[PDB]
Design brief:
This protein is 6% helix and 22% strand. Strand 8 (136-139) and strand 9 (145-148) form a beta hairpin. It has three domains: 1-78, OB fold (Dihydrolipoamide Acetyltransferase, E2P) (Beta Barrel); 82-159, SH3 type barrels (Roll), CATH 2.30.30.30; 160-237, Ribosomal protein L2, domain 3 (Irregular). The protein is built from two helices and twelve strands. By secondary structure, the chain is mainly beta. The chain starts with a helix and ends in a 9-residue tail after the last strand. The chain is elongated and about 70 Å long. A six-stranded antiparallel β-sheet has the order 5-10-6-7-8-9, with no helix packed on it. It binds three RNA strands through helix 1, strand 1, helix 2, strand 11 and strand 12.
RNA sequence: UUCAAGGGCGGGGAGCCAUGUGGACACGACCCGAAUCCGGACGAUCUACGCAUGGACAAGAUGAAGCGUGCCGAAAGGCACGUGGAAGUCUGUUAGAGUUGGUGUCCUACAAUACCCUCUCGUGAUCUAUGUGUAGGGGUGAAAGGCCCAUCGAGUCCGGCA
RNA sequence: UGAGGCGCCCAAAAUGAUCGGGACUCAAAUCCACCACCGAGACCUGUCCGUACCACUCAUACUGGUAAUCGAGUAGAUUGGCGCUCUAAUUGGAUGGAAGUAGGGGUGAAAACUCCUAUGGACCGAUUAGUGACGAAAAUCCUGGCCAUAGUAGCAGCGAUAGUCGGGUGAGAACCCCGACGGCCUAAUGGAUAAGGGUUCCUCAGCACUGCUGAUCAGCUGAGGGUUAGCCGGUCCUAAGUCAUACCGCAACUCGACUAUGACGAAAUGGGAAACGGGUUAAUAUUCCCGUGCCACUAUGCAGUGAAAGUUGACGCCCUGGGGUCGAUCACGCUGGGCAUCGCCCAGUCGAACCGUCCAACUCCGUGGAAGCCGUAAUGGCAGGAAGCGGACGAACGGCGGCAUAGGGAAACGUGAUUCAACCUGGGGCCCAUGAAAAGACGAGCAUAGUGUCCGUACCGAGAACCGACACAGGUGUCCAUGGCGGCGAAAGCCAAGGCCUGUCGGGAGCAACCAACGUUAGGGAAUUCGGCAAGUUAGUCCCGUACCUUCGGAAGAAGGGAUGCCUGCUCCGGAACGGAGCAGGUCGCAGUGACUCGGAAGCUCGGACUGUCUAGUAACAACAUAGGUGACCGCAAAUCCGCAAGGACUCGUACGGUCACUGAAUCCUGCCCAGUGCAGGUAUCUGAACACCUCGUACAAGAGGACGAAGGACCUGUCAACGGCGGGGGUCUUAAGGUAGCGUAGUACCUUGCCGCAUCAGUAGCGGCUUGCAUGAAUGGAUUAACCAGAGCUUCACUGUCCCAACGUUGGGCCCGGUGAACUGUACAUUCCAGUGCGGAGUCUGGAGACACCCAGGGGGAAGCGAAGACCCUAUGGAGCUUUACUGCAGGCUGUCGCUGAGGACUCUCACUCCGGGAGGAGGACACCGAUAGCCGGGCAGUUUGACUGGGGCGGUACGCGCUCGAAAAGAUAUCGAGCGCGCCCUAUGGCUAUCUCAGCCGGGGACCCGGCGAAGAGUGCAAGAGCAAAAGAUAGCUUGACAGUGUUCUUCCCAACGAGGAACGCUGACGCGAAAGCGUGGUCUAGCGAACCAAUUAGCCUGCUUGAUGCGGGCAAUUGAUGACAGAAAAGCUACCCUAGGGAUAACAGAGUCGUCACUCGCAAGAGCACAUAUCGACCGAGUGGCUUGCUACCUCGAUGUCGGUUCCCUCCAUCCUGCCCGUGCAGAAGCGGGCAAGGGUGAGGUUGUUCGCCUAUUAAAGGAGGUCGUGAGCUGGGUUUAGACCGUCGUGAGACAGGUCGGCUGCUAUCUACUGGGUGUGUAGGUGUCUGACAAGAACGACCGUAUAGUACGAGAGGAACUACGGUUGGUGGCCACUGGUGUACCGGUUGUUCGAGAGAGCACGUGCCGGGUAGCCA
RNA sequence: ACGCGGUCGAUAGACUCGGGGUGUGCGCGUCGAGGUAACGAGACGUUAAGCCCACGAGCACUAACAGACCAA
């Protein structure tokens, strides 16, 4: 047959690329030698096209102007701190080791100094649980207990823009506008609605996947469609 | 070959070469005749979809939130009028886009997809120009096997090839 | 009373009857005889030829001889010869005329040879031996040329109907130019331009070419000429993004991703230093020239120390205030023009960049001091300081002054105002959407001077300059969006500025038929049709008023009702408008949204929620999307995906994420099932590869085995919003469960037009209800649903030429004339018609009939018309796309192992390697990545296969390998999907021999046993059938292993007649068994019980392996066993309606033809009943026929196409007669029924469901008959149904996909050559003229039918009821004609009136060929 | 193609009547709701008006003239 849509994606042609030339910046934590002698002033609040959430423009002492992944509650004028000796307050960044257990954190690093990888989406937050000299335990938004180097930097507070998902798009047009700001091909034609030549589920008088949808993990691309290595399906049991 | 016997093959000197010709096999194999398959190339001046930079949408209708005034109420609020001007909102041959029916006209055409009337959309998932990207078992596809220069259930060109 | 001969009845078919025809009757018939003739290429006979043979001969050279016993021929075999090219040898011809060509003479059976004459003007032969790109009627053959077609189609159709009269030029003028008159275009038919074109631009001279006719013209031809820039583009910047170099990959590169660097990337339309006005040319022009101005750089001089912070460049969508120019308009003045019943109408009244100046809004400061005020269109503002007052900063492409005794104008050479595009500046709102960058500029003065190069510059920009082969009705971007009336308007309609008469052939006929567009139609009003298709109805605005239902938004402009002009004078809102809303009075018309513009309305049902998407070019939908619902994967060194790799998308992303799927708004809901399949988890035990390890083997190795055992499987569990499933039976069974809520005859229900009801005169429709659901049912989503819809179906009101039933008219064609001028098609012949025949569907054959030639117009019956090597069907050891648990493989994932890889069945470490980090260093770590290999999964991908037979194919079957009987026709052989029926073994005895013996069955004496008799065979003999067998081939007993080894002959397999395996009979040799012996035993009495090569194993001996010896392990001779049943041997599944090719009438579908079981109809016999009574009437059984309407059968015609059903329209026919006419019978009183006879003249109609045919139904009727004509009729119509491509449901299928089920949508080409006919002409014949006739022939339905009255309330009859002859009046259908009457038309005409233009008036144009409305003469019509 | 007339003529047109269609012309005068007036839709009279006719009659005024040819 012909390659399925999932395979066209991989080629990275314009149709499937994100509008990177329109994205602002990558809210990665600042790099400080040591001391925490770094503080900046929130100069403005902006809209981040790549995340549909607000971002805070900050001006640091040493003269560096950079956008930051803002938690909820940060406003113009406010002063933020970044470093080991940073004050324990919303909007400030410091290594987990300095954060007190039971404090909601966001933009958590996976490996000390990487800039932040976890809990960066609207209204989410990781929960710092256990402390130690060898391992900091964090409960990520998915509910998973993650073991991180106490040296991994993070920001206090939850990510700005919470509740974004509570309002329905209501119309295709609204979905449309949002999709135009992401690396995604939309709308979506169902596999069962295509010709046999175009998808494993295509073909047949009436629409239906003439086969079980739960596909094996070992399936090759082009065949791995439907419910990938499902441990179970449905709502029952 | 055979305890044995019986079979098979061969045996009392004619061949070798040349020229013409009959016929066989491989090769194009008396000549033309078709749908393929494969290789390397050339196409996104059409069109599909994306991106960049620009452009277009008379006029009218309806009258959401919000706000106001008055009245009622302890209050929460309610009621009336006004204001306001929302909307993949309505009418609309505005521009522009499209095409339900006539199974009209045409059907060696004006035209290898045209003409007329009727019809639909017309502030948005809108329409449109130019630039730009994606290439052949690959693209692109709100999916019709649609579209990728009058050609697509696998483009075109030349070659494989007689 | 029997028999025979001929005939009669029985006896009905479709265009025109037939024995071939005429026609024949003591025959021209039939039968019995006879007589004489005609009549082939046969037979006889003369001559000749060929061939075979004979004699003679070197001869196949002559000559002679023989043929009663020689003479036809497709495929094919054999042999002699003709012609063409060039070579060679020998030998000739030609300028006293070669070859070729044309016409003609002679020869040869013929291929072909040869001569003559004319032309021609230079080459040409013969013989012999060679050579070969050597012979054409054909291939939908190729190329070129050419005829008919034909002076034919086109040069008309488009909302752009365009001209006419004079004149100019010229050899020539409808279309080249001038004037007048008349028109066309207004987002274009005008102005400026982008792309693209490329000289098309201007001038002169031309008309052979090009131009839909002509041409003096031109985008054509010839020759010249034309594009001028510091300030308009380019050039500069960067955008998406591209390339180059480096680096890396790759076998490699012109290939490839990242990361660096550099460059490239915007001419209308991104950013951007600076130019305006006028004049000038045939053609350029912000470029030249005149006037004025401006920018950048540089130099000089003065000033300046500032200089980089900041600002700008620089930005989305929606609403809106303020400032404000042009334009437009109003008021008044000036200048000029127009008009002339008035006094109006038109134009102009100008003047730039630039320099200077003014500043509203926003922001801010001072003052002030609000506790309720300030302000807006709106939001809003304020003790964190409102209003007010003052101030800083600060706008226009704007105002004002200069510019300007510049320019421009014939002149005047204005002034105010309103509405205000441009442009300037603010306020508000929206985002799960956030609306470029860079160069540059400002910041940062002035004088003077110098420099400012390079490239583009014409023209078109489109119904003739671009693309579409064209001077193509198509396509093609930008700006002019503010010209006047109009009105809501960038709408219509009319008119300016400007453009044009080139959406380029004309002339003529009251101008016929017919067609395209269109106007008007009395009465009826959807009767038309599948369907109101088409057309129409409604319509603008204001007032009143508005239902069910609803998601409370909506439904809604629901519906329904009323008003609407003009004139006079006013009121209200507003600053005002040349803005809006009303009032009073007057008044005209048929009509006041007067034209134009401008909704028909309502209800029920199905589907999809909605806007949106789609098959460029037959599908716009119910299909796709969608928000919403749901499930799955993944913590980021992730999941998913691309790349061979280097690397990459997702991703400037991080679970409120984004990937993979399903369902498809809201609302109420979403049951049961984990057995199979899928996925996932677990797993004692079982199973599970390679490496390493161990044993055997080998001096080594191959190899055999063992131990260990990863993923995987077995096994267990979870999971259905995972594939899917929810039956049959009984009051459980398969296979897990056994269908819950709902809905239900459905777009799912075959039965089926289900049943009831509604509605209609009548309703296969539709709606409601019931519902056992052939075969509904819950995210394969169920139900339901307001709103929405060019979606499917139904009903109503209104309206109407859809119809009854057609008419008249309008414009363009059509017809005639000038000019221009194709194509399709053509084996030939061709004036046909009726029948027949024929490969059964003939203009050409046969028989008749008819037929004087040619031409014009027509509508299309036929040429199975033209156009396409049938799309349907089958066939091919064809193709392709698609599917899967088909065959075989390939990627990919998982997993073990080896290398990378290090130190001290579980562990630590660090040093390789990986990752994070700017770095230090941190994390990880011998793992991971990567290289190699092994096991599992693996339609993601590739190549293939998927057989044959067959009354076409599929399904079914196997007549696909064997045996018997019959078919089989008395030797042998012999077919069909022919009839009956078997074999794929079984048996160590059920084999072999010998001895002894005789069996079924029946009878007699004491179903077991014993005795006797009869008993040729009916028993038994393994199994089909047919056959064989009695001191046996059977039985019993005993013994035995010949069911043995080797090797043949012959027959069979395969008649004849070649072919393997297999089989049989018969031998020889060896060794045996039994018997006295002869002899018997090569399995079972005979005919079924079977298998190649390659490979393996096995048996016994021997041969052999690369210099040589030994050992291992191989190779071979002979044979046994292991299977291919598609059985003389491939390893092997499907779909295609997305399809494709080659062919087939070798093979199906429609139709034809044959048949006639079926069907229709008839006849014979007449049981039976009809109260009695065969025969008034009904009529079983059985028997005999006719037809060719039904169905079946066949495969004869046709696959290089003969278009389907139904309907429609139009014509002819048949009779087996429904009515009408005339009759007979009656269980006939009458009236009326019932049955029958002659008879085809005429008639046989309108409607409801349904595509329907048929049929069911309704009201009428004299009756509302049936059938044939290719189931007449698509070069006539329709397109509802059938029958492609899209889609849905049910059922089936794992799936692709299917269904002889349902359902929505879905394209109909052509200019007529011949023939045929309807009408119209010209000629010839009879044979200068006029007028009048005749009548062979030919056509008719010219007439058919009904009602009523008198007869008559009579005859008849108890009564009830109730005729006829005949004479009348009328209706209906058909027919021919006519217009006084009624009606229609009537773009003659007259009138009314809306918008606009001509100033008003008068009088007119346009609004489609009448703007609209009213009336209507002639004529034509019903 | 056919039919009629051609001066021995009414064949066609002009003109005039007749017969028809429409519906009361231009202009002027009076009136006219009003309005100081200007002005004024419309009404009445003149007006069986005006305009028009594919028909008929009369009428040689114009045109059927002039004239060419064939023919037993
Ligand atoms: Cl989303
Ligand atoms: Cl010869
Ligand atoms: Cl330019
Ligand atoms: Cl404002
Ligand atoms: K055929
Ligand atoms: Mg970031
Ligand atoms: Mg996008
Ligand atoms: Mg979808
Ligand atoms: Mg599809
Ligand atoms: Mg597939
Ligand atoms: Mg393009
Ligand atoms: Mg309002
Ligand atoms: Mg004779
Ligand atoms: Mg010689
Ligand atoms: Mg030749
Ligand atoms: Mg031939
Ligand atoms: Mg013709
Ligand atoms: Mg033209
Ligand atoms: Mg009518
Ligand atoms: Mg009907
Ligand atoms: Mg319609
Ligand atoms: Mg006022
Ligand atoms: Mg339905
Ligand atoms: Mg829809
Ligand atoms: Mg289409
Ligand atoms: Mg549509
Ligand atoms: Mg669905
Ligand atoms: Mg369920
Ligand atoms: Mg489904
Ligand atoms: Mg035909
Ligand atoms: Mg064919
Ligand atoms: Mg194939
Ligand atoms: Mg395949
Ligand atoms: Mg025999
Ligand atoms: Mg084999
Ligand atoms: Mg063996
Ligand atoms: Mg065989
Ligand atoms: Mg084909
Ligand atoms: Mg045949
Ligand atoms: Mg046949
Ligand atoms: Mg009869
Ligand atoms: Mg009677
Ligand atoms: Mg008749
Ligand atoms: Mg019939
Ligand atoms: Mg037919
Ligand atoms: Mg026909
Ligand atoms: Mg047709
Ligand atoms: Mg035709
Ligand atoms: Mg239908
Ligand atoms: Mg399909
Ligand atoms: Na192939
Ligand atoms: Na393109
Ligand atoms: Na249409
Ligand atoms: Na391809
Ligand atoms: Na041809
Ligand atoms: Na012309
Ligand atoms: Na819409
Ligand atoms: Na299961
Ligand atoms: Na079901
Ligand atoms: Na729609
Ligand atoms: Na009509
Ligand atoms: Na015809
Ligand atoms: Na295919
Ligand atoms: Na096969
Ligand atoms: Na069968
Ligand atoms: Na044999
Ligand atoms: Na018969
Ligand atoms: Na028909
Ligand atoms: Na009759
Ligand atoms: Na036919
Ligand atoms: Na047709
Ligand atoms: Na038909
Ligand atoms: Sr990052
Ligand atoms: Sr980083
Ligand atoms: Sr499917
Ligand atoms: Sr459940
Ligand atoms: Sr493009
Ligand atoms: Sr809309
Ligand atoms: Sr609209
Ligand atoms: Sr249609
Ligand atoms: Sr029409
Ligand atoms: Sr067409
Ligand atoms: Sr194409
Ligand atoms: Sr080739
Ligand atoms: Sr012969
Ligand atoms: Sr012969
Ligand atoms: Sr014309
Ligand atoms: Sr046309
Ligand atoms: Sr000439
Ligand atoms: Sr550049
Ligand atoms: Sr304004
Ligand atoms: Sr055009
Ligand atoms: Sr003009
Ligand atoms: Sr012309
Ligand atoms: Sr009329
Ligand atoms: Sr109807
Ligand atoms: Sr369409
Ligand atoms: Sr729902
Ligand atoms: Sr399971
Ligand atoms: Sr039930
Ligand atoms: Sr014709
Ligand atoms: Sr059949
Ligand atoms: Sr025997
Ligand atoms: Sr199957
Ligand atoms: Sr289909
Ligand atoms: Sr008869
Ligand atoms: Sr009768
Ligand atoms: Sr029926
Ligand atoms: Sr039929
Ligand atoms: Sr018929
Ligand atoms: Sr149809
Ligand atoms: Sr003659
Ligand atoms: Sr009586
Ligand atoms: Sr007109």
């Amino acid at each position: 047959g012909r390659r399925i849509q999932g395979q066209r994606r991989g080629r990275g042609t314009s149709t499937f690329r994100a509008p990177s030339h329109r994205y602002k910046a990558d809210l990665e934590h600042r790099k400080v030698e040591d001391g925490d002698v770094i503080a900046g002033t929130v100069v403005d609040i902006e809209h981040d096209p790549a995340r549909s959430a607000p971002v805070a423009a900050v001006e640091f002492e040493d003269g560096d102007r950079r956008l930051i992944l803002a938690p909820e509650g940060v406003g113009v004028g406010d002063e933020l701190q970044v470093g080991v000796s940073a004050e324990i307050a919303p909007g400030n960044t410091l290594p987990l080791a300095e954060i007190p257990e039971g404090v909601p954190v966001c933009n958590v690093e996976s490996s000390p100094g990487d800039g932040g990888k976890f809990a960066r989406a609207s209204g989410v937050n990781a929960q710092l649980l256990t402390h130690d000299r060898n391992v900091a335990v964090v409960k990520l938004p998915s509910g998973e207990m993650k073991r991180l180097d106490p040296q991994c930097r993070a920001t206090i507070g939850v990510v700005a823009g919470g509740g974004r998902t509570d309002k329905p798009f209501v119309k295709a047009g609204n979905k449309h506008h949002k999709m135009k700001a992401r690396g995604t091909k939309w709308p979506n034609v169902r596999g069962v609605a295509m010709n046999a030549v175009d998808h494993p589920f295509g073909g047949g008088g009436r629409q239906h996947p003439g086969k079980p949808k739960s596909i094996s993990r070992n399936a090759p691309p082009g065949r791995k469609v439907g419910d990938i290595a499902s441990k179970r399906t449905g709502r029952g049991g």
